[PDB]
Each structure stands twice: as C-alpha cells, then as structure tokens.
Amino acid sequence: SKDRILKKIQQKKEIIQKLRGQPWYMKRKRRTLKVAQKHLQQQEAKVSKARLYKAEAGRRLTQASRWLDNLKIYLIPWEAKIRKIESHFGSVVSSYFTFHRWVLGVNITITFIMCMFVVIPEWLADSRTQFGDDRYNKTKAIKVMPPAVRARADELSTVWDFGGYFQYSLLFYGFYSKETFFGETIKYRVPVAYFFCNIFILGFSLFIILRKMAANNRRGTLSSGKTQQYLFNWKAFTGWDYTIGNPETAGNVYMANVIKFREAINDDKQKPSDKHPWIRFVARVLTNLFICAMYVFSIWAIMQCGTLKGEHFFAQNATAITISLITLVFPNIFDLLGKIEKLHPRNALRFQLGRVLVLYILNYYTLIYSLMLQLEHLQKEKNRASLRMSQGGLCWETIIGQEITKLVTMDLYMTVASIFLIDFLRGLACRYLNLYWPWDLERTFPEYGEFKVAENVLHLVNNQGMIWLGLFFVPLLPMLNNIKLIILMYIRGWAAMTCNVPASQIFRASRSSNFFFALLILFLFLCTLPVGFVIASKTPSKSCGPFGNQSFFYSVITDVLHENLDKTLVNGIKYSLSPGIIIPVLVLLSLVIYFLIAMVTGLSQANQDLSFQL
Amino acid sequence: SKDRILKKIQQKKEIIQKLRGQPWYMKRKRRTLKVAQKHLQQQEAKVSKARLYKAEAGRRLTQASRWLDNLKIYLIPWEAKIRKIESHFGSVVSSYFTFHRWVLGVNITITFIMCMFVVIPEWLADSRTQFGDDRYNKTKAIKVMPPAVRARADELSTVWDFGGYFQYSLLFYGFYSKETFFGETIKYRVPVAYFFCNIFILGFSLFIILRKMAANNRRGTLSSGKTQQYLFNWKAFTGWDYTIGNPETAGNVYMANVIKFREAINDDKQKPSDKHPWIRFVARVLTNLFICAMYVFSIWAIMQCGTLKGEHFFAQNATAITISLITLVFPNIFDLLGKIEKLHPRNALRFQLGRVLVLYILNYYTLIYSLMLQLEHLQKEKNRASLRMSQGGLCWETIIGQEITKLVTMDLYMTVASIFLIDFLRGLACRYLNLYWPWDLERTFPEYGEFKVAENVLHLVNNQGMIWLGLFFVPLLPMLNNIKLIILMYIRGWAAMTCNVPASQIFRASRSSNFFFALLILFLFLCTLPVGFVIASKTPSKSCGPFGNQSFFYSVITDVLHENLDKTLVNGIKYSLSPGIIIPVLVLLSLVIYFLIAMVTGLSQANQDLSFQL
Amino acid sequence: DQFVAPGLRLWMLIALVGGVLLIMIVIVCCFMRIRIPRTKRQIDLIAA
Amino acid sequence: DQFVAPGLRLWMLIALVGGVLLIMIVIVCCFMRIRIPRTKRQIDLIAA
Amino acid sequence: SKGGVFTREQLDEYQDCTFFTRKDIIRLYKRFYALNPHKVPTNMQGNRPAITTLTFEEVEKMPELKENPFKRRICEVFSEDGRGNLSFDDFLDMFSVFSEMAPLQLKLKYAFRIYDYDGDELLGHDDLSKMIRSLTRDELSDVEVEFIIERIIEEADLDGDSSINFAEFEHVVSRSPDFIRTFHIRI
Amino acid sequence: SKGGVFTREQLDEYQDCTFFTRKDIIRLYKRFYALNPHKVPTNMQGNRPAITTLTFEEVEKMPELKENPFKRRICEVFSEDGRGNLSFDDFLDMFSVFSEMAPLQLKLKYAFRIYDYDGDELLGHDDLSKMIRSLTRDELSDVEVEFIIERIIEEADLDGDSSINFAEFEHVVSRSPDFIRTFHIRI
Ligand SMILES: CC(C)CCC[C@@H](C)[C@H]1CC[C@H]2[C@@H]3CC=C4C[C@@H](O)CC[C@]4(C)[C@H]3CC[C@]12C
Ligand SMILES: *[C@@H]1O[C@H](CO)[C@@H](O)[C@H](O)[C@H]1NC(C)=O
Ligand SMILES: [Ca+2]
Ligand SMILES: [Ca+2]
Ligand SMILES: [Ca+2]
Ligand SMILES: [Ca+2]
C-alpha cells in the first residue's frame, strides 16, 4: 500500500531536480518548487526512523554538495579574462584559452601528486637530517656540493646549464636519495613512491583526458549523424555566434555568412572547379618536395647542433635554441607555401596542421636520438662538462633532465620573443610605417595578425608532451611548467587583445570539441614510449639515486615483491609479463575494441531512430 | 552530352545487376533484362579502344565468375543430408550441421596449407633420399626406427601410444628434419616454413572466423534488433518455421506458439508470484556448491589419472578416457541439476551453456598442467621409456603431440559410444521396454532423446581447440581431424534421424547468429595462448624435430634475419620487441575500453529510458 | 601380453573382423533408414 | 667574461636591472589597455 | 552438365534473373516434373516453361509445403495467373525468394504479400486475426486473439491508420533476429 | 559571500530554479543594477526581484547583446509580461538559458522560440526570410534568400506542411556540431 506513496514521492523528488531545466518563467518555477517541497514535507506516515535518518543524511549531503560547489566556483581563475577575449574575438578563439586553463589544472594536479607523494617526503627527510647523521653520512655525496661546484655555481654558464644549485636541489632526479623511507614498520619507501608516482601520473593523465572527452561527448554534440543532409540548416541556425561583443567581429561574421551562403548556393557543381592547365599541380608537387626538404633539414640541423662542444654562451644552448627557432618559424613558412599551393581553405588548414604535427613529432624523436648519442659519447669520454661528474658518475638521468628543462625554458623565452616581434612590433610597424612603405603593410602584406588557435594549441600540447617526457628525471618540472603556463596565458591574452585582429573567416579542421584532446592523447602516447623503453632497458646510474646502482629501473619493485611474496606467484607474474602472453592479450584487445566500437555505433543509430519515432 | 551515354550505360548495367532481387513476376524480369541488354547493345555510340577492351574484359570476367560459381556449387557436400535434417527438425537443429560443414571446410583449408607448405616438401625430401646419402646419414637418427622399435612396433601397446610406425612418420613433430632446404639460390627452409605456417594458420583461422562473423552479422543480414518493444510483432510474424517438413514438428511448433502467446498475454506482464520463499534459493545455493564440487573433483581426477601409470590397456589411456567421460557425462548431470533448480528455461539453458564452457576451459588447462608436470617428471627421471627415448633423446614435443592425438581419438571413440548408448540403445529401451517398466519410459524419465544443439556445438569447438593446440606438434592433426569430422557428421545425422525426437520448444540461449563463431574465437584465443607461451619460453628437444639443437623455438628466423640483414636492423627489431613498448599500449587499450564501456552503458540506459517513456 | 601371433598378431585379426563387421553394419544402416522413436499420436493412443 | 663586483656578480646585476624593468613595464601595461590594430572603418579612409 | 531440357540461353536468363545456378534449376525442374510427369514435358525448350502449369493441390502435396499453414497463400502470391494453377516460372520465383541467398528486403516484401490475405497492401485486423488463428490452430480464445491483434497493431501504427502498411511492417520485422531464419525453404 | 542584497531563502530558491551559484547571481544583480541604478533598488528582498523592470532599450545597451541581431527577439522571448519591459527574474532566465551548463534541449527550445517571430509555434517562410536578412545584413539578393529558404524547408520539413515544427527543428539542429558553441552568452 505504501508503494504508491513512495512512488509519488520519488516522482516529486525527480521533478525537484528536473525543474532546473524547464522552459518556464520564474514564477512557474517558484510555484512548482514550493508545491513540490510542500508535498515532500507534508507526507504523513513516513518511512521508518532508520530510513528517515537516511533521508535526512541524504538531504544534508545534497546541501553540503551545493555548498562545496558554491565555494569552488570562487576558485576558477581568469573567468573575466576569458570572457573578455571571447567577447572581442569569439568562441573559437576562447576555446584555446579554456583548453589552456584545463591543461593548467591538469598540470596543477600532477604537481600536487608529485609534491605530496615524492617531493614533500624527500624535503622532510632532508630537513630532519643533521650534520654527521647516518643519512647525511650516506647522502653527502649527492646532496652536499664539493667546493669547486660551490665556487663555480655563481657563474652564468652554470646557471644556463642548471648545473649549479639547481643540480643539488629537489628539481632533478639525482638529488633524491635511495635510502629515504618513513616508518619503523610497513615503510614508505621513497624510490617506490617515485616509480609508482611516475606510472600513476601517466595513467592518471590518460584517464583524465579520456574522462574529459567522454564528458564532452555526453554534453550533446556527439549526437551528430555524420551526414551533410542539413548543410543549409546548420549554416542558418548556427550562423551567428552569440558570444561576440565587438562590432568589427560582428561585421566579419556578417561577411563570412554572406560568403558561406553564396558559396553553398553556387557549390555542388553549380560552379565547376577549374584552374590553370598544369601549373598548379606542378607547384603543389614542388612545394611538397620542398617541405620534405625542410623536414630533413630540420632533422640534420638538430643532429648537427647536438654535436657541438665548448662552454660558450651558445654552444650549451644550441640545441634548444635551434629547436625553438624551427618550431616558431617553420609553421609560418608552411602558411606562406599554402598560398602557393592554392588549396581549399579548410583543406589547406588541415594540411598545415598535419605538417606542423609531423614537424613536432620529428623534432621530438630527433631530440631523443641526439640526446641518446650525446649520452653515449659522454659515457665513452671518461674511459664545464667535467664539472657534471662532481655529482658522482655521469648521472645521465640528471643530464637528460637538465637538457629538457633548458629546452622548456628556452621554449618559453623564444615564445615570448616571437609574440613580441611577430605580433606586437609587426602591429606597430603596420600601423605607423604604412605611410611610407610601397606595399600596403596593413592591407596587402602582412596583416596585423590573426590568432592562430590551432598552432597555439599544437605548441601547448608539444610543451605538455615535453613535460611528460621529462617528468621522470625532473620531478618538479610540472611545477616550473605551471609558472610557464601562467605566463603564457597572460602573454597570449595580451597578444590577443592589443596586437591581434579578428579573422576574416573562421575554419575548423576537425569541427569537433575533442580534437585538442585527441592531439593531447596522441602526444601522451608518443611520449610514454621513450620513457618506458628507458625504464625497461636503460640501466640506472651507479651513484645518483633513487635507483642508484640498480640492475634495472624496475628492480626496486621486483625486490619489494620478492621480499614480500617469495611465492612463485611472483614468478607467475613475471611469467605473465612475458612476450609469449602479452601478444595474445594485445590481439584479444584489438578484437574486443573492434566489436565495442561497432556496438556503440549501432546503439547511437538506434537511439537516433528512437528519437525520430517520437 | 558525351557523359549522357556513359550515364545511360551505367544505369542499365546497375539495373541488370539489381534485377536478380526484384519483387517481379518472371515474365517482367525477363522483359526488363531483354530491354536492358538491348540498350547495352544501343551503347554502340561508345569510344572504342581502351573503353571497348575494358567492357570486353568486364564481360569476360563476369562470365568466368558465373562459370566458376556453377562449378563450385557441385562441390558442396551434404546438401541433401542437411536438407533432410532441416525438414525433419528445423532451422535451429540444421544450424549445427551447417556450422559443422563450415568447420570442416576451415579444417580442410588448414590441412591444405599444412600439406602444401610443410608436409609435402618434407615428403618430397624423404622420397628423394637414398640409402647412404648425406641427408640420409644425418636424418637416420630420427627417421629410421631402431631394430628394437621395429620388433615392438606391431604390439598393441605401442599402437595405443601412437608409437612405432606412427612416431616415425610425418604425423608428429619429431620426424621433420632440421636440415631440409629446397633452394639452390634462395633456400626454401622447411623449419622456417613450419614455424611461419603454424603462425600464419593461427592468424588465418582468426581472420576466417572474423570474416565469416562479419559477413553473417552485416553485409547479408539485418545487423539490427537492439530494442524490445516489438515482442508481439516478432513472435507473430516469425512464429512459423518455413523449413519444417515433418507433421509432428509442425504440431510442436503450433503448441509452442500457443504457449508463447499465452505467456505474453497472461504471464509476461500480468502475474509475478512466488510459492516457497527462502526454500528454492537454498536449493539453488546447494546445487551451485555441488557443481563447484564437481568442477574441483574433475580437476583433481584429471591430475590423478595423469599421475597414474601401469603401461596397461588403460593406464596409458587413462587421462584421455577420464577427460572424455567427464565431457560426455557432466553436462547430463548439469541438466538434471538445472531441472532440480526450477529455473527459467532460457536462463536454465544459459546457465547450462556457461557451466559446460567453464568445464571445458578447466579441463583444458588442467590437461595442460598435467602434461607439463608429466614432462618435467620424465625429464628429471632421465638422470615405455625405452621406446620414448628412441629418437636421440626425450622428444617432449612428440610426446605432447601423442597425448593430444590420444585425446582426439579417444574423444571420437567415446562420442561414438555415447551416441550408440544414450540415443540408440536408450531409444530401443524406451520403445520396447515401456510396457514392462513400472513407470512410463517415454513420458517420464528418460524420454526419447533430443538433439542438444548447444552441447554438440560446444563439443565440436572443444575438438577444434584441441586441434589448434596440437597443431604445432602434430602437423597432420587436421587431416585426421577431417576424418573425425566427417565421421561425426554422418553419425550425428544418423542419430538425429533415427533416435532423436524434435524438442517441444527451442529456447535458444543466444539471439545472435554469431554465437557459435564467438565460442570458436574464445577457444582459439584460449588455445593460442599456451602454444605462444611454449614457443616463447620452452626450449626445443636437443636432438629431435625441425628445430633441435637451437636454443629457442623462434631462434631459426632470428638467425635467418641476423645473417641476411645488417646488424642495426636486427638490433632495432630487438629493441622494438621489448616489453617496455607493449605495456603502455595495453594500459591505453584497457582504459579506452573502460571509457567505451561507460559510454555504451550510458547509451543503453538512455535507450531504456526512451523505450519506457514511449 | 596376450597370446599374440598366429602368423600375424591376434589384435590385428580381431581388428580386421571388427572392421568388416562395422563396414557391413554401416552398409545395412545406410540401406535401411530405420526410425525408432514413436510419434506423439502413437504415444498417447496407447496410454489407455 | 663578466667579473665579480663587491659581493655581487655582473650578470646578477644585469639580471636585477632587467627584471625590475620588466616588472615596471608589466605593471604599466596592466593599466594602459592599448589597442594597436585599426578597424576596417579606420582603414578604408586611407584612400583620401 | 548435360542440360538437355533447357537451352543455354534459357539457363543463362534464369541465372541472371534468379539466384539459382544450373544445377539448382535442373533439380527444381526434376522436382516439378516428378510432381506430375504427365502434364510436365520432358523438354522445356522455348516458351514451354511459362506454359506448363500444375494445379495448386498438385504443388501443395510436396513435403516442403504440405505442413505449412500458408501453403495456399504462397501459391496464390507467386501465381502470375489467378485461375488457380502455378507454372514453372512461378515455381522458380517462389523457391528463389525462399532460398538462402535472397535479400532481406525481397523476403520482407513477399512475406508482407503472403500475410496480406485480402490483397489491399495493408495488414488489417482480419488479416492478423487469420494469421494468428492459423499459427495456433485456433486454440487461443477470441479475447486472447483480439488482445494480440491490438498489441500488434498499436506497434508500428505510426500513421494511426489502424493497419500496417509495408513501411511499418518492414521497419519492424527487419529488426527481428530470427525472421531471416524462419522465412526459408531449402530445396 | 557577502549575502546582503538577497536573503538566503531567495538565493537557495534561485539555485534550485537556476544553474547559477550565489556568486553568479550576485554578479548578474550587479550588472542589472549598473544598467540603471536610478530605478534598480540597492536591496532586493521579497517581491522586488520580480517587480523591478528595465525597458528593452536599457537592457540591449549592454555589450553582451547590443551587437546581436536578435537582441530584440531575445528580450521579447524572455519577457514574462512583455509590454516592453524585462524584470530581474527574466534577466536571470535569459542569462541562464544562454549559460554554458544549460542542457541542449532547453537551448534548442528557446532558440526555436527566438526564431519564431510571429509566435505561431512553427518557423514559417517569412520567419526564415527575416532571419536570413538579419544574418546577412540584407546583402544577399531576394532569389538567393528564397533558394536558401526552400533548401532549408526541403531538408527539414518532413511533414509536407511548408513549415518547421519544433520536432523537425530539434531533429535537424541536434546533429549540428556548432549550436552548443554558438548559442552561448558568457556573463
Ligand atoms: C605465402 C605464399 C603465397 C608464398 C610462399 C613462397 C613460396 C611459394 C616461394 C618462395 C621461395 C620459392 C622457392 C625458391 C627456390 C626454389 C628452388 C627450385 O626448386 C624452384 C622452386 C623453388 C622451390 C621456389 C618455389 C616457390 C617458393 C617456395
Ligand atoms: C649444437 O650442438 C651441440 C649439441 O648437439 C652443442 O654442444 C652445441 O652447444 C649446440 N649449439 C647450438 C647452436 O645449439
Ligand atoms: Ca488487408
Ligand atoms: Ca499504418
Ligand atoms: Ca511562424
Ligand atoms: Ca513541418
């Protein structure tokens, strides 16, 4: 008999939540809310006191959730900045800044994990250390500077290479002792935390990006039918951006809509495509050949600047400067050559994005190869560069960390310089010198500057990939990256407001909200391979912890498991972790994923149909 | 205007192609074909040369394809047999025989591959061999039986063990020499062909099963049916099987339709009820516990009979007899327990399928474990056995192959005996002893036999999986299996026509038509895992088989690559074949399938809610 | 071991006679087309 | 090579002056609210 | 093979217009002749395949249609001429539609035509009543039959016409996981 | 949280009836008061949030709407009492429907209401015509506008009624990958 009462109460509870999204005036919402609340409180002969207290606890939990959400809404930064940028330019441009804030949040989470589980315990152990202490006795080698390094740290050359106080700090791999633990029993071994935190950070980053992509699909944009049957409707009912606040951007939108509608009327073979007989095809072939030549030139230049020696102001930073210059220059050359190619604007944008992505991947792997060769050469050299041996042995992990942090800092500096020159100084030139130049700088070449959203996204994802690659050797790398991100944000915002001009027409290569996160997962997958290979194959250094004098990088976990489950079962795991078993598992995953993709496909179509029937 | 002729020609050609499936009378189809052919003649306003020769080639190719299909249709066996079985019983029963014929075709393809690439070249080498030849000098150890084995070859004990002439034959792994090449300039190395043929046969079986499953799901079927609202329409418009020819099966279909409609209109949505609360659940729990006890008893019995010796008519075949008896007996006990569990018939059949599948998997892996333990014991015992150690040492691959062949042959013999016992003799006892028995043997236990399609499919898939596992050690295993399949086919059909009664109802466990192929895929994976582990971990017999002295099983192709390619390429291959490169891929796959599972769960929930809303 | 060899092995002779018996019975079964189970009409018409 | 000033290094002094200059210019630009590019209405008038 | 009954032209036309090979066509001709050797000639060169006819009773007596309650409906649907006899061309069409290789859409169309007793291109109330009472040998009571008819109609009554046209019938039955298995006649 | 202008009950009621938090509601009130301090009271407790109204012109002068071609349509759609006025409750409704967290269905409903100039529940020919005129600043020629209207109708009008009902509009636009991005007003 109580079933009807509980059912109607549950229905009214559901109405309470559903009221937030109803197409009703505020008076109707207020009346319905009051009536539903009165019905909820009015119910006589309620459930038993245990479940009554359960309902009370649920209401208190809902109130606490609302309170914590209200508290959290105060902690979202740059809402005003992003709103102003969106108003001046639009949703497409502000998408980059929203993505930047999200990446900053992910990096903040990574920093919190690294600090809580790795950096802070090591700092506490160092602080509790005393002169003459056993931990000091056994960590003086990798924690206390020799007098030569202490004297030379003040020199600018050491600061360039991070070989001064930075090397003997919690920033790099070598400083972390392999004897650091907490607890008389069930010890909290710091090297184990280091390894597990690196692995868990990789996995957690992958999980977070996947969760964001799933949330974006859940939002409703995934309901697209992958069809062009509604091109006119999608150009008419989404033809205006409601986020525009600047009149000039509004006029640009008007002109773009006129162009799009006229083209759509005249497209579909109404105006057949025609060009020069053979000139443009040969031009495209030659441009592609020259772009491949620029690719191989970039590879060779990275290799050549890798094999540069000395202590000069430039020989130490030659590789980072070269990589940054290539990254900040070659996309401009690609854009210029796109004019020669004369492709479809969307197709041209897709080609340029693919070319920049390929360039980034090639530069990344070439840097990996060059650092490998340099490490091998330095290892062979033994039997200022010599000062790096003061830490104890080569500490090639620390050398990789120093190189990667030099690359990151130089990327920041060169990005700031490029923003200052290409955007600001060019803007001033086009504004003032236009009275004298024969070419109309503003009108013909070069314009004041359009904010390349996709190129900036690619640069940010490349930076995040470098952070992922260097995270193992540089535990505090994301923290520094945080500062970089913040700086970039502000500068980019400034570069948007004071220097850039709204684009005449906006094209999206993907037209999907998860494309940036697709690039992010691609870069994460590419970056997780070299570090995994290093862990599985490369032997750790014999002096610098936390894996000092270990047979392998994973030997710590193996020793821990052996000490704790001497059972062959450990061997059974090893047994599992075997080439003859992981390949059947890989093909089973490939067979299951295929089936799964299809199922969702079909489910979506069916849903499609259900809705249609309604 | 020129393209108008091409358009008319293409339209007439597609009309000709699509005419085969039009809902038109024969006269209409013939008239339309004649008119379309006349227009294909009117095409004479067509450019000659390249287009004319292309049209001629297309016509010749389609004529050749039609001729090939006409020749092929004569080679499909058992069309009359399957037709008679389907007419007597129905589509569900005949589905097993169609699947049996398809599995026989797959096995014939595997046999052809093994013979052409492995068996026939080795036979040619043996035939071209002469006494006193260098090849004979080197293969005498593993090809010529010693005089003791010659004397003991004809004993029944050796025949039960597949020794003697069987061991010294192309049937087993050991007989194949490691020094057989058939190329003066570029060698066709028989061991390389052996290894790559086994790997390619595994991959090709996977590909064939996937292709058949895809062709059965899409591109020839509905590939739909994710909803439930069409229950009455599906039970009314598919309520009769048009393949029924026997009147009694028709009456059974009438009664089943009556029952289904009454359940739908009176029981499915009107009356849920319970009779003995906290009593039936106790019986369910007790039955499940007893089934787990049966599982552990089966595992223990397999282990014990593996440990049983005695070199008698039963000690040598004890394990095969035990496995076959368990396979043929335990499903009947499971059916009886499901009868005492008073479960829903569809859920009862699903539980029976799952239980028999689990039993097969457990018996499979217990057999593998017992085989490895016996091999280890025999190898340690080194420092009957005299016949086992004939081929230059303990050829454990040949021993494993002999055990698998024992399993296959004993499974065939026990299946024949079971069909003769519980179908033929049971039928005779129920027919002629009914009037003497205290209770009715035809309306009460045990009624006339019913063809258990699901259990027979599971048995067939188990046999095919055993073939897959034993294929590496027994090159001619499919060939013998072919005979077995053929025999089984006939016997099964005979039983169905002579002993079995059509089922009162067919509560098919799986709605999909690819369930049998899904089980085949599952068994293929579960069988390719152990052989892969053996290849990657086990060392081959020192003086036996196509590999012999070599360290690993894959070492032959590694040596080939190392000798025929530069060192850097092989080093790169070894670097890319490291566990550090595969594990991140596995982690990414696991996380993405978790995300896809969440997404599909959300989609299914949305579909359910939409269906409920109506 | 059984008394094995009257020229050939005894198991060979018993296998041969079993094989010829099997061939004969399968030939007969192919040429017979028997049907053991009764139809439901036969089952219920004799229930009295 | 830069040399060491009394209790300081020359590159350190250069870094300090550059940093304070950067801080000052950042502070100023946080209030200036400048806008370099011209609007199209401010561009098409160049014909005269 | 030999193929003396039909010219190569006739067999080629049948292959291009049906799903049967030469062997299938020859076997179907043998079955048709065995149905009544007197009326069916030994050779069917030329116009004979469309001329020779067998009464509906002479065709229903074959085992593939004897136990089917819709045998009369199948014969009437596939008969080009409504005088009550089925020719060899109609025989071939009937057993090509029911063959394994027939597409889903063709089978759906012909099943809709079969179940359309009154032949008005709509599956009305009376057609469903007759189909249900034929499927259950009239064992179900009148109220049960009416309930099943109402439940069937309210499914796929998108037009609200109280009947099922071919569009609704196709949309519903195409998603049935076993229609393509039951709607089959192997010969 | 200062919590001075409103009461805790009013803020809780708004949070129940709106996607905004307390901070968002306070900021929206600040903007509404800054639009015209001479008539918006400094304290809003009780019935005053529903009675204090600004003329449509005073609301359109804000930057978030002054550049929008449909600002008048938005104001008329969200005006509960119409009569050329817009209260604070209507203000919150307007900037909540355009918020980031609004569901796709609600935004689609209000977009359909906005584009329905005549207010007859279906997007007719003239509504699409004037929408195109506003979107392209009347630059397109009459024949081009007519062609675009005909194409839109042919794509969406599956009922043959020469107009787009809300079901057709929902079905067409939910597949658009840009409606969520464009139909947004951050404030
Ligand atoms: C995967 C399949 C299709 C390709 C298999 C490769 C086979 C067919 C090729 C590769 C090497 C070839 C052999 C190379 C050398 C000889 C020696 C001489 O006797 C001629 C034939 C023979 C024996 C060739 C036969 C064909 C051959 C075996
Ligand atoms: C090969 O030959 C003998 C055993 O037959 C052994 O001494 C030698 O180590 C073996 N080497 C290889 C390549 O396995
Ligand atoms: Ca009708
Ligand atoms: Ca209808
Ligand atoms: Ca209207
Ligand atoms: Ca309409």
Author numbering:
A (entry chain A), B (entry chain D): 89 to 471, 583 to 813
C (entry chain F), D (entry chain C): 15 to 62
E (entry chain E), F (entry chain B): 15 to 201
Paper text:
Transmembrane channel-like (TMC) proteins are ion channels whose function has been linked to a variety of mechanosensitive processes, including hearing and balance in vertebrates and touch sensation in worms. By contrast, C. elegans TMC-2 is localized exclusively to body wall and vulval muscles and its role in worm physiology is less well explored. Here, we use cryo-electron microscopy (cryo-EM) to solve the structure of the native TMC-2 complex isolated from transgenic worms.
Particles that corresponded to a cis-dimeric complex were selected for subsequent refinement and 3D reconstruction, yielding a density map at 3.2 Å resolution, sufficient for model building. The cytosolic domain includes six helices oriented nearly parallel to the membrane plane, all of which form extensive interactions with CALM-1. Unlike TMC-1, TMC-2 is not C2 symmetric owing to the orientation of the TM10 helices, which are offset by 10-16 Å relative to the TMC-1 TM10 helices. A phospholipid occupies the cleft between TMC-2 H3 and TM1 (“cleft” lipid), and another resides in the cavity between the TMIE transmembrane helix and TMC-2 TM6 and TM8 (“bridge” lipid). An additional density feature that is consistent with a cholesterol molecule resides proximal to the extracellular side of TM2 in both structures. The pore appears closed and is blocked by three sites of constriction.
